[PDB]
Design an enzyme around this catalytic site. Structure first.
Site, PDB file in Angstrom:
ATOM      1  N   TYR A 119       0.858  -1.179   0.000  1.00 35.30           N
ATOM      2  CA  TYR A 119       0.000   0.000   0.000  1.00 35.30           C
ATOM      3  C   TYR A 119       0.896   1.231   0.000  1.00 35.30           C
ATOM      4  CZ  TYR A 119      -4.224  -2.670   1.562  1.00 35.30           C
ATOM      5  OH  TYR A 119      -5.293  -3.533   1.696  1.00 35.30           O
ATOM      6  N   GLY A 136      -6.518  -2.180   5.403  1.00 38.39           N
ATOM      7  CA  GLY A 136      -5.214  -2.542   5.937  1.00 38.39           C
ATOM      8  C   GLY A 136      -5.052  -2.402   7.442  1.00 38.39           C
ATOM      9  N   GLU A 137      -6.174  -2.390   8.179  1.00 35.84           N
ATOM     10  CA  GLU A 137      -6.205  -2.341   9.644  1.00 35.84           C
ATOM     11  C   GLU A 137      -5.477  -1.113  10.231  1.00 35.84           C
ATOM     12  OE1 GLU A 137      -6.449  -5.420   7.922  1.00 35.84           O
ATOM     13  OE2 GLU A 137      -8.463  -5.439   8.843  1.00 35.84           O
ATOM     14  N   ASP A 179      -9.042   0.390  -2.036  1.00 34.72           N
ATOM     15  CA  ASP A 179      -9.022  -0.995  -1.589  1.00 34.72           C
ATOM     16  C   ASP A 179     -10.436  -1.427  -1.261  1.00 34.72           C
ATOM     17  OD1 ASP A 179      -7.059  -3.081  -1.116  1.00 34.72           O
ATOM     18  OD2 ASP A 179      -7.794  -3.081   0.987  1.00 34.72           O
ATOM     19  N   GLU A 180     -10.949  -2.450  -1.944  1.00 36.78           N
ATOM     20  CA  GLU A 180     -12.226  -3.077  -1.591  1.00 36.78           C
ATOM     21  C   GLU A 180     -13.415  -2.083  -1.466  1.00 36.78           C
ATOM     22  OE1 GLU A 180     -11.288  -4.737   2.246  1.00 36.78           O
ATOM     23  OE2 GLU A 180      -9.748  -6.142   1.539  1.00 36.78           O
ATOM     24  N   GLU A 228      -9.627 -11.493  -3.655  1.00 35.21           N
ATOM     25  CA  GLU A 228      -8.987 -11.824  -2.383  1.00 35.21           C
ATOM     26  C   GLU A 228      -9.716 -13.003  -1.783  1.00 35.21           C
ATOM     27  OE1 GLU A 228      -9.755  -8.525   0.649  1.00 35.21           O
ATOM     28  OE2 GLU A 228     -11.571  -8.172  -0.571  1.00 35.21           O
ATOM     29  N   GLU A 275      -5.024 -10.435  -2.301  1.00 31.06           N
ATOM     30  CA  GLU A 275      -4.895 -10.789  -0.898  1.00 31.06           C
ATOM     31  C   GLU A 275      -5.359 -12.243  -0.748  1.00 31.06           C
ATOM     32  OE1 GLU A 275      -7.168  -7.937   1.472  1.00 31.06           O
ATOM     33  OE2 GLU A 275      -6.054  -6.244   0.679  1.00 31.06           O
ATOM     34  N   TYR A 280      -1.169 -12.032   1.316  1.00 26.67           N
ATOM     35  CA  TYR A 280      -1.319 -10.970   2.280  1.00 26.67           C
ATOM     36  C   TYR A 280      -1.583 -11.629   3.642  1.00 26.67           C
ATOM     37  CZ  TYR A 280      -3.122  -6.465   4.108  1.00 26.67           C
ATOM     38  OH  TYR A 280      -3.341  -5.370   4.877  1.00 26.67           O
TER      39      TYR A 280
END
EC number: 3.2.1.-
Lengths: 775, 775
Positions: free
Chosen positions: B52, B101-102, B177-178, B305, B346, B378
């Site tokens: 990222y 990505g938390e 992302d998503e 993913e 992912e 990932y």
């Protein structure tokens, strides 16, 4: 001619034994196979066969009994009970009336239901459809009781004859199955609104009278009542919460009355222990069972069960440990209070799609580690359902049983086998009691709330105890994985003397908690106990009136923050403390004032320690949970709390991944993960290294006399031997490390002595799981 | 100096290659380890490294940039990109704006949200608390778009320079992302009610113009309107369902617009392919993604993913096969239309407490098996979050990554390694296209209903597709475990030609179904097709008006039973058929009239086959599910249907437990349970016996030119070699059979020959996973 017991083991003619069994339901296996299957069972070291007797099956029409295979071979109950006896096995009999067992009506005959639908239970919206499984019945309805006794009046005579007390096989009788009100107790307003309950001075009205005044009720439900008459049973959550809980304990009491009726009837025929599986399909609520049965003085042996996966692959990894530690804890509590032996009568061996042996072994081997050494595996012998008697599975009754329908032995035998050899070879282990310095304090009212899933709009803390307390991320799973094996105490039942046997008591708290139980907690701290309390303090009593004895005793002012129910709206905060950096927590934290601060979110103090009298209290304004990571900040926080209150553990480990439960002269070691794990282990004065290749459990002896030899330690499980000889089991290694006080090693059977470290410690090298040592 | 592709693999400089990568988030790993970690990734055979780029991180204060690691070392994006190139690895780059990505705000800066709250999304009830994770933002709000472009304008230059086409490493760039409206699209009325939408001539209002008339809305929402302006966005389900789907599709559209913008800006700086991960975090709704991106001619590469376990042990066994087969399926469908390569960007390797290598493998290997042969793992390298930027995990970012924080390599590396060696050594297998003779017919509106968990009081059939279709007992799991590896077609998007590439089509069906799709199905049957349609026929169009086209065409009167929502009240019924005895089914079975009766419950006929035109249609009035047992009656009924409608399979197996996926010149054999399995397999004209001891996957070459030697078959996985020389892998046995048309086995490296059977077949004996044969 006598079946007795102590606190620990059942006795036959004063020869005390370990019940180790499997379930063979004869009514579901072809008659000509029975012989082979019982021999096979026997060949795995099982000494006991368990089977239900299905009222349904043996009285297929009103009045027409057949216990001798006349109408159908699988009705040959007499046959079976003589064959088991002839083969040397003991029998545990479960005559119902209800057997659950994935069987039509749970054993209740259609004819009873279809010619007396007045016994059927009712919702607030009237009758249940006939489509439904285990068609709910009003327990204390007399018609159903007249017919329930008529079944017992035919069957108990047959059981009378085959009692071990009269030269037969049968060593225990069990009352009904998992009496849960036909599995409708989990929904508060599904059941039971039958007009025998409900009506003016019905069951109900009479139960309110016996337990409360209008007093009492006017304090509880917040309303005046002329007479008990006016109090209708609740039909929704708009009604006051203490009412819904009364409706809960009332349905529980009804079950207990139905149970007592059966027991008293059984007691007329049978002089061997009378047993009961998992009343209510609950745990905390055994509080009521215990009080009921102490009130009425019924010698009922409380038996338990363990199920973790249905119609789905067997899923038993570390995730399930908080629950297992919990359940065995609360079981141990009530079973040691009633002073009868612990026994899992249904330990899961079927009804998962696969049962993989190492996950199965994690369940089966922890039950003795957790104090439940008598075991029965259900369902042991796969079968097939007679036509017209199907319910939950249709034709099949062989979903991955240890022995299948065609006689095949499935993988999960390998660990049933050895756990048997282990239990039978170590009487000293079995005659241990489980230690625990730490205990979890359960408040029973919290069960209901979490069961029903309902949180009052006006409460600050969530009722999702399944997430935060019991489940895969639950606090109790964290405690297990932090090597803090715990007892459970029921907070209402337990005296202060019992509380003060424990160094530490962990309590999860919600909005409400009784004066008496908040008064108990303040005394425990004041006397020199150490309390951990989480995620808030209570401020209301059992009847939802203000009560802050605990808050005020501590001098702890806890912010009011509403825990969020919407998943997306639940926050992630990161909690710093001394030695711990950014341990994640879910859901709102509460500022906590007074005491020295120990936990922070930024500026905000979310944890504090308070000393009063000889002891202390830690109060955390967040939901402390199990989260795995390299940093391992949650497991550290636990250690950090334990240091703060000064409870050192019995076991120390260089690697936190090593799970360890001390049983005095045994150290149960657990790798709950399928992964290489090693590190050192200090316990009981000794220390040693261990490597655990896969997932599984070892029972490791320390400072003990076994088979004539004094051992300091041995890094493998004793499963037999002979005079100055020890047969060991280490399936998690190529290697084992033995130490001994006053002997030498003459030789090794299944390997060789690869080392000396000296002072009498040897490293053995074995290419199989099993091996022997001559001393 | 170019990055191209055929529909199968990406090409560098006309050299085609398998993208086999891991994620390393440089920003979360100490810079002075980046070298060792990247080296390690390469020594596992990874040729690509994904990362990222966190707007957040690199723009700590509005207008203050850092990509050279001035302020903090981990800001050195440049030095990382150079180090990745220096060491050989191609880079995949994901610059955002949102990265998930938390990570704090999922990459969005604190200052943007603080200093411009007008961009924050709104619920019907107003603002979202600041406490919440990934604080949601309105995507098209100018101010956000302005600052998203100012981030894209200060990063895409740096990407330009390191693109492969300018002598660099970066072979693609991914959008966001998503994109799922910040994980708020799952909830129908959570989002977005910002005033930029909603207002008279809001976004919303103009969208309703673009896509509909007052015709249309007058019919759909069941009300006369003056203008578009009177129409409010829906705030609850007691607005009409068609409106809530329009609201659903409008939220999806906005995301597609946000995507198009970001795409249009990227295209300015970049000539490498432009990727997008799992739009809407939905599957069926990729219909809208495809339709949109065709209408706008955007050369977007749709990646995917695979995640199955969060904050809990990894749990990938047979239960997840329905889902995997469906996901890969509908991913194959859309990515073959768009004619781009299949990539899992992912593929789970972190965020599970333990990731057991056999379960990991079963996923990682089923992805190629199911057509997805470019793979990224990932999260590959275990990190630590910089203080301030913590979100979901706090400090830690090494939850069981393949490489840990201290450099450790964990057990799920073993399956990554070999699957590398396999894909790279076997270009043939990659250049296969996935067969499927049988397909599942997804109807996109059903996804929305399942996702929300809302079923209209009025509907007969439940919306729990999670249980009845996708899940651990889902029909799709049954199909997989019954060796019917299936394709997925979107019933709305696909043309009658496409549908007829398939012998059988399965459709799960609720109350409503479009005329244009109900017409596509009645033609499919008449043109010589076979339909299995379950558990009821529709009687309503996309706008909930009557439309019984299919039901009248077949001449089938299906019952009106109403599926029950309450767990306890759902029945267990026992379905009989020609050859299958008492197959179990949950919930209401419907009587089905017309056609020859194939399935019974008592006297009531609950299934039937209808011949109409050139072809036929099975219609089952029940929910056919995956239930495992000895009797195996559910899997047999599936055979019994494929017989009826005459679809021979491509593989045959003497043990149903052996799961087979045909890939032309290869056979993917899979044992999904950790148990001993064996049997004989007939495929592609050749037969042989195979034994698999544990859980895993083999790719078995059958009748093929590999490394210059003609194989008939070979019971192991081809993972490399040299000339007239094959390297093999069989971690599921000590023994591998090998047949050959032309040649003879000269030597054996990691084993020996143990036998001949005759006509050139040779049984190898290898004491390790790997071996080599020279011909």
């Amino acid at each position: 001619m006598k079946v007795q017991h102590d606190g620990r083991l059942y006795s036959l003619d004063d020869e005390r034994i370990v019940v180790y069994g499997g379930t063979l339901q004869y009514f579901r296996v072809p008659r000509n196979y029975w012989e082979d299957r019982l021999r096979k069972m026997k060949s795995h070291g099982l000494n006991t066969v368990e089977t239900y007797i299905a009222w349904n099956w043996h009285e297929p029409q009103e009045g027409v009994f057949d216990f001798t295979g006349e109408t159908h071979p699988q009705r040959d109950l007499i046959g079976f009970l003589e064959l088991a006896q002839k083969l040397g096995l003991y029998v545990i009999i479960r005559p119902g009336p209800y057997i659950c067992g994935e069987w039509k009506n749970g054993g209740i005959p259609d004819w009873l239901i279809n010619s007396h639908p007045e016994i059927l239970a009712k919702s607030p919206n009237g009758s249940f459809p006939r489509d439904v499984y285990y068609p709910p019945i009003t327990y204390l309805h007399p018609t159903y009781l007249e017919y329930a006794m008529k079944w017992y009046e035919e069957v108990l005579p047959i059981i009378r004859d085959y009692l071990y007390s009269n030269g037969g096989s049968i060593i225990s009788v069990t009352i009904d199955d998992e009496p849960s009100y036909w599995e409708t107790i989990f929904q508060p307003f599904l059941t039971d609104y039958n007009e025998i309950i409900v009506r003016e001075n019905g069951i109900w009205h009479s139960w309110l009278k016996e337990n409360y005044s209008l007093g009492d009720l006017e304090e509880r439900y917040g309303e005046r009542f002329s007479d008990y008459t006016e109090i209708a049973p609740p039909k929704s959550f708009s009604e006051p919460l203490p009412k819904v809980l009364d409706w809960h304990h009332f349905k529980i009491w009804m079950i207990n009355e139905y149970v007592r009726r059966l027991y008293e009837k059984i007691r007329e025929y049978v002089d061997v222990p009378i047993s009961l599986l998992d009343p209510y399909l609950l745990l905390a609520a055994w509080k009521e069972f215990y009080l009921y049965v102490t009130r009425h003085k019924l010698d009922i042996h409380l038996w338990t069960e363990f199920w973790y996966s249905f119609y789905r692959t067997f899923d038993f990894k570390e995730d399930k440990l908080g629950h297992l530690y919990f359940k065995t804890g609360i079981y141990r509590y009530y079973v040691s209070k009633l002073k009868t032996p612990p026994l899992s009568i249904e330990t899961q061996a079927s009804l998962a799609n696969v049962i993989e042996k190492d996950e199965a072994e994690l369940l089966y081997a922890l039950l003795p580690a957790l104090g439940i050494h008598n075991l029965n595996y259900y369902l042991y012998v796969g079968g097939e359902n007679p036509r017209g008697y199907e319910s939950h599975n249709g034709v099949t009754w062989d979903v991955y049983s240890p022995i299948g329908l065609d006689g095949r032995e499935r993988q999960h035998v390998e660990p049933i086998k050895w756990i048997g050899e282990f239990l039978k070879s170590n009487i000293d282990f079995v005659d241990s009691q489980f230690k625990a310095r730490v205990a979890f304090g359960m408040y029973e009212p919290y069960e209901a709330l979490n069961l029903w899933g309902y949180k009052p709009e006006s409460f600050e803390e969530s009722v999702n105890l399944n997430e935060y307390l019991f489940g895969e991320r639950g606090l109790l799973t964290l405690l297990a994985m932090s090597n803090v094996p715990f007892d459970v105490i029921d907070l209402e039942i337990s005296t202060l003397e019992e509380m003060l046997q424990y160094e530490q008591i962990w309590v999860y708290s919600l909005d409400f908690m009784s004066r008496e139980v908040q008064e108990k907690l303040i005394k425990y701290v004041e006397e020199g106990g150490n309390l951990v309390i989480l995620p808030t303090l209570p401020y209301l009593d059992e009847n939802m009136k203000p009560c802050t004895r605990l808050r005020d005793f501590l001098g702890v002012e806890v912010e009011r923050a509403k825990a969020r129910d919407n998943m997306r709206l639940i926050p992630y905060l990161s909690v710093d403390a001394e030695g711990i950096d950014r341990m994640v927590v879910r859901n709102v934290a509460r500022e906590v004032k007074g005491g020295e601060a120990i936990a922070w979110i930024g500026d905000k103090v979310v944890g504090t320690i308070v000393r009063k009298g000889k002891g202390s209290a830690v109060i955390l304004g967040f939901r402390l949970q199990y989260y795995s990571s390299y940093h391992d900040m949650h497991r550290k926080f636990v250690d950090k709390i334990l240091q703060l209150q000064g409870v050192k553990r019995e076991v120390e480990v260089s690697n936190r991944d090593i799970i360890a439960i001390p049983r005095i002269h045994y150290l149960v070691l657990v790798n709950p993960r399928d992964e290489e794990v090693a590190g050192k282990v200090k316990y009981r004065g000794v220390e040693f290294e261990i490597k655990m290749k896969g997932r599984g459990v070892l029972f490791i002896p320390v400072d003990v006399e076994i088979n004539g030899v004094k051992l300091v330690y041995a890094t493998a499980t004793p499963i037999g031997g002979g005079n100055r000889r020890i047969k060991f089991r280490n399936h998690l290694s190529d290697t084992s490390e033995i130490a001994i006080r006053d002997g030498r090693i003459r030789g090794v059977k299944g390997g060789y002595v690869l080392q000396e470290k000296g002072e009498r410690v040897y490293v053995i090298r074995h290419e199989r799981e099993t091996f022997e040592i001559e001393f």
